[PDB]
Amino acid sequence: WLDFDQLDALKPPSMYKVILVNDDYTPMEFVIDVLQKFFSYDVERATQLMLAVHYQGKAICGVFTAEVAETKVAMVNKYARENEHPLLCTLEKA
C-alpha cells in the first residue's frame, strides 16, 4: 500500500522514447530481465532488443508520455543499481 504523507499557442506535452544504453559489464541476461520486467516483452523480442543494444550501442524500449517515461527510467535505473550493474536507462523526446 501507499502512504500519501510519505512516499497564445498551447501545445500538449510530447511523448518520450525510453532508451537502454550499452556497457561492457551488464550481462545480456540482465538486459533481457529488464526488458521483460519493466517493458513486458516476451523472451524472443527481449532477446532481439538486447542484441540491438549490444550491436547498435542503444535501443528504444518503448514510447510513453513524459510522465510515464520518467517513472520507467527511474525504476530501471534503480533496479540496475540494486543489482550492481551500470545499465543506463535514458529518455528523449519522441
Binding site: F4, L10, F64
Partner: protein
C-alpha cells in the same frame, strides 16, 4: 495533514487504478479524482470549467496512455509516477510555507500546474485555468 476529503479522493483514485490494473497512478488520475473532491471542484466551478468535458478528456487520456500490468504478475503493483509524488509534496510545501498545515484538494490543484509536462496541467490551461486563478479563489472566494 492531508484532510479527510483529500485522503478519501486519493485512496479511491488509487483503488480505481488498481482495479483497472494500471501500472501507474498518474497526475491525470489525480486530476480526475479532484473533479469530485468538493474543495477542488468548487475552485474549478468558480473558474467556469466544463467539468463534464474535462472528465471525458482525462478518462480518455488515462485509458489510452496508461500501460496495464500483465495478467500474470503479482510481484509488482500500481505505483505513483514521480510526477504524482512531486504534486503531493509540492501541495504540502505550499501550505506549510504559508505557515499552515491543512492540505485540501484545491492546494493539490494548485500544485499540478508545476508539472509542466503533464497532460493534467495542459488540460487545465486548455480550459482557461491558471495557477493564480485557483490561488485567488482559495484566498478570496468568488
Amino acid at each position: 495533514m492531508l484532510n479527510q476529503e483529500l485522503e478519501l479522493s486519493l485512496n479511491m483514485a488509487f483503488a480505481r487504478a488498481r482495479e483497472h490494473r494500471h501500472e501507474f497512478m498518474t497526475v491525470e488520475h489525480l486530476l480526475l479524482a479532484l473533479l469530485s473532491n468538493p474543495s477542488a471542484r468548487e475552485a474549478l466551478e468558480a473558474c467556469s470549467v466544463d467539468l463534464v468535458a474535462l472528465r471525458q478528456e482525462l478518462e480518455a487520456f488515462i485509458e489510452q496512455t496508461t500501460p496495464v500490468l500483465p495478467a500474470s504478475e503479482e510481484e509488482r503493483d500500481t505505483q505513483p509516477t514521480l510526477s504524482f509524488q512531486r504534486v503531493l509534496q509540492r501541495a504540502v510545501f505550499h501550505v506549510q510555507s504559508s505557515g499552515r498545515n491543512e492540505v485540501t484538494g484545491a492546494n493539490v490543484l494548485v500544485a499540478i500546474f508545476s508539472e509542466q509536462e503533464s497532460q493534467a496541467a495542459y488540460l487545465l490551461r486548455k480550459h482557461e485555468v491558471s495557477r493564480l486563478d485557483v490561488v485567488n479563489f482559495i484566498s478570496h472566494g468568488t
